[model samples]
Target chain A: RVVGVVVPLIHTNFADEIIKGLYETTISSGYELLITYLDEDEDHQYQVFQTLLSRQVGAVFMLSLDIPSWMIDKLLEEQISVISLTALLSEQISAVTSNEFEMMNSIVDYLIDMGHKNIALVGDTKLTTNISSTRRTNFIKSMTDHNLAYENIFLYGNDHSYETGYTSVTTGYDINQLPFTAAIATADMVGQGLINAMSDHGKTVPEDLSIVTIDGLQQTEIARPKLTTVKQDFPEIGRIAMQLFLDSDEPQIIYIPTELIQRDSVLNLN
Target chain B: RVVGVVVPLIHTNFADEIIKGLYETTISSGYELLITYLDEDEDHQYQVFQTLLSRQVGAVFMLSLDIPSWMIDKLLEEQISVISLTALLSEQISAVTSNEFEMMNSIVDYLIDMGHKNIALVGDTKLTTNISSTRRTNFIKSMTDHNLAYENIFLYGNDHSYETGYTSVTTGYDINQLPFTAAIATADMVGQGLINAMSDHGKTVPEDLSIVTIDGLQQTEIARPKLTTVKQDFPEIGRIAMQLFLDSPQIIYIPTELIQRDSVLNLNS
Candidate 1:
C-alpha cells in the first residue's frame, strides 16, 4: 500500500520531525511513501492534494497550516483515508492532537499558584480549531477554578505569526488600557514575539511581566528569558496517528500529552 | 516525464518557498513531480534515493545539505539529472548557491567603514564545505583590507544555531578580552542569538555592540532589534534552481544576489 504525507510547510524544526517520523515509520512497515511539502501556500496545498489523489495513494498524513474545508471534503469524497497531524482539520477526518486543555490549565495553574490573577491570553482567532478553544476554555476554567476574576483584556487574537504576537499584545494593551502581570500565548513563535515586544518597551520578563505559551520549538530554550512553555510531541503524534490509520478499527482521535516546562520566564508573584 | 525534488530538511521558510516553487513549476508544466525530504539520518537519505532511482525520475533537485558523496554518486551513476540548491557541493553535481563571500566582505567593510575596528567574528567555520572556507577567507581579507589587526580572542566558531550565539557571547567575558564594538555572525538567527545574549547581560545592541551577519531571513525584521544583515534573494534562487533542473543542456551553478536590510539594532559608531 502507498502512504502519502502532505504538509503545508515543513520548514520549521517541529514540522521537520513530524515528516521524518512519518517517513521512517511507514517505510519501515514496508509501505511505499510519497512526501509532499505544500510550502505554506493554500493554493499549492490544494493542488498537491489533487495530485496525490491522482496518484491514488491508500492513505494520507496531512499537516496543514491553511487547509481549506472544501479540500478536506473532497479528500474524504475521494475515499482517501486521511489523518491530520498537529494542526487541526474538520472532524470529517481522523486526527491526532495534543491535549491542549490539560496543557493550558497547567500553564494557567502555574501562574495562579504564583499568585498572578491579572493573566491574559493571546492566540490566532475565535474560529480556530479545538486547540485554541481548549486553551481559551482552560484559561477561563483555571481562573474560575482558583476563584480569580478573569479579565477579557487578556484574551487577544492575531493572524498567527510572530508579528501577530507583537501587534496583538501591543494593540490589545492600547485598546484595553490595562496592565497584565502574566500572559499566555497559544503558539511558541508568537510568545517569542511578545518577548521581543516586551524587550522593546523596556519590560523584562518575570520582573515586569511573566510570560508562558504552548507549542515551543527547541530554540525557545535559548531565548532571552528561556521560554516557559508546553512541549507538543510531534514525532509521537506522527507515529501513533499513522498506526491508527493502519488499524481496521473505527476512526479515532488520539490525544498526545503536552508537557509543561518550567523555565525562568515565569515568576512567582506570591 | 517525472521529476523528483530532494530536500535535506523541509523545516525552514527558505526551503518551503523553494519546494513550492519547484512543485508548482513542475506540475504546471505538465510533468509529474515527487518531493523527497531527506531524513535526519544520512542512511535514510540513501534509501529515499534508491527509491527515486528505482522509480526512474527524469530529473531531481537535491538540496545542498545532502552531502553524502555516495548518494550523489549513485544518483549520477543512475543517469538521473540532479540540480543542487542553496547549499554548495563539490564537483560531479551542478549547484545553485548564494554568493556568501561578496556579502560577507560587504558587511565587514560596512562595519569597518563605520569605525568598528575591533570586531568579533562569530560563526565562521571551515569544516562544513567550500562555502564556509569562502566566507572565512572573505572575512579575514576584508579585515586586513581595512588594516585591522586579527585578534585570535575575537574569533568564535559556532555550530550554526541560536543557542551557540547565545552561549558564546554571554558565558565568556574577561578583562583581557578584546574590547570589540561589533560582532559579525554567519546567519541572522545567530545574530539574533548574540543580541539576546547581550540583552541577558543587560547590554543593548548597537549601544554595546554593533552586529551584522551574512544571511537575512524575514524574522530578522520582526526581531526586537531589527538586524542589519546581507540578505540573499531566496525566492529567486529557488526559481532558477528548479528551472535549471527541469530543462537544461548542461549542469549549471546559479548565484544569489546580496540584499542589505535594516533592523533596529544598528548603532552609529
Candidate 2:
C-alpha cells in the first residue's frame, strides 16, 4: 500500500528531517511514500488534496497543514486514513505534535529564572493550528502566573516568516515604546529576525534586548548570539505518525517531547 | 504542452521565487507546469529524469541539477527539449545562468575597495556545476590581479550548506591562524554560517572578520549585521529559461545581474 504525504514545502531542513523519519518507518513496513506539495493558500491546498485523492492512496499524512472540516469529512468518508502532523484539525483526525504549552511554559520559566521581570511575547496573532493557539495561551498564562503585568507589549504578525518578526521589531512599532527588555518569539525564524532587526536598530541581543523562541532549526543555531530555543523532535513526530497510520486501530493524539537548548540569545539580568 | 520542472526542493525561498517566476511566465503563455521534486543524490536525479521522460513532456527544465553526460545524450536522443537552469551540464544543452565570473570579480573588487588587503575565499571545493568552477577561478584571478598575497587562506567544504560553512570556519583551522581579515563565501547560507561560527569562536564580524558572498537570500538579510552579498536575479533566470525552452531555436547562455548590497558586515574596523 502506498502512504501519501502532503507537505507545504519539501526543501526545508524541518520537512526534510521529518520525511527521512517517515521514509525510514514506512519503507520498513513495505510501504512507499507518494509525496505531494502544496502551498499555504487554501485553494491550492484543496487542489492538491483532489490530486492526492485521485491517486487513490491507502492513507494520507498531512504535515503542518490546517485542512477544512468538509475536506476532512470527505477523506474519512472515502475510508482513507487521515493523519495530521503539527496541526490538529479535528477530533476525528489523529495528530502528532509537540507539547507546545509545556514548551512555552519552560521557556518562560527559564527567562524568569534568569531574573527577567519585564518580558514580551512576539508571535503570529493569526493562529492557524491548535499548536499555535496553545503556545499563545500558555505565553499569557505563564506571564500572569509570575504576577508580571502583561501590557501592550504583545507584538504580533500575520505570518511567522522572518520578515514578520523583523518588521514587528523594526518598523512595526516604535523602539522607544518597548517597555520590556526580554522577548519570547513564536519560532526560531522569528527570533532570528528579531535579533537582526534589533541589531539594525542599534540594539544588541541579551545586552539591549534578550530573545528566545521555539523550533531549534539550523538557522537559529547559526544565528548571531545563537538563539536559545525549544527544539521540537520532528523526527519522532514523523515516526509516531507513521506508526499510528500502520496500526489502523490506533487513533490518538501523540505529544512529542521538546528540549530547551541553551544558547547565548538570553541574558541573565541578575 | 506542459513544461516539466525538476527541482531539488521547493521549500527554500530561493526555489519558491524561481518557481513563482516560472509559473507566471507559463501561465501567460498558455502552458502548464508539471513539477517534480528530487533529492540531491545523483541516483535519485537519474530516476526522476527517467520519470520525467516517460511523461513525454514537451520540454524539461532541470533546475540546479548536475546531469550525467550519458543521461543528457539519452534525453536528446529521445527528441526531448532539455533546458538547464543554474547549472550548465554540456554545450549540447541550453542553459540560463548568472555571470559567475563577473559576480566573483565584483565581490572581490568591493572587498578590495573597502581596504581589505588580506582576504580569504571559503567555498565548496568540489564544483557541482560550471558556475562554481567559474566563480572559483575568477576569485583566484581577481585576488592575483589585485596583487594580494592569496595563500593558505583558501578553505573548502564538500557542499554549500550551513554545516559546511560552520565546520569550515569552526573546526577546519585554528581561529588564531586566520591570516585574512575578510572572507568571500560562495553562497549566502555559507556566509551566515561563517558569521555564526566566528561569533561562537569569540570573533565579531566586521570588527574581527568581514564577509561577502553570492546569493542574496532572505536568510542573509535577516542575519546579524545583515550580509554584504552579491544578489543574483533568480526570478529573471527562471523567466529566461522558460522563454528559451518555448522558443526552442534560442540556444543561448543568459547572464543574470548580481547586485552588491552594502551592509554592516564589511567595515574598515
- By lDDT, the best candidate is 2
Looking at model 2, the pairs that clash are: none
Highest-scoring model, TM-score: 1
| Model number with the top DockQ | 1
lDDT of 2 by residue, A1-270 (tens): 567777664234576667777766875786656666555566655665665566566788877545567667888898989998876867888999987678888988899899887776776656663334666678888888878766723746766677777887667667756677788887777787788787887888878888887778777767767888889888888889899988875467889999998988888989
The DockQ of predicted model 1 stands at: 0.38
- Report the TM-score of candidate 2, chain A only: 0.90
Residue A101 CA displacement from its true place in model 2, Å = 2.0
Model 2 lDDT per residue over B2-101, tens place:
5677666523356666766676677668665656665556665565566556556678777755555666788788888888876676778788777667
Worst 10 residues of 1 chain B by lDDT: B249-258
How high is the CA lDDT of each candidate model?
A: 0.69, 0.72
lDDT value, residue B171 of candidate 1: 65
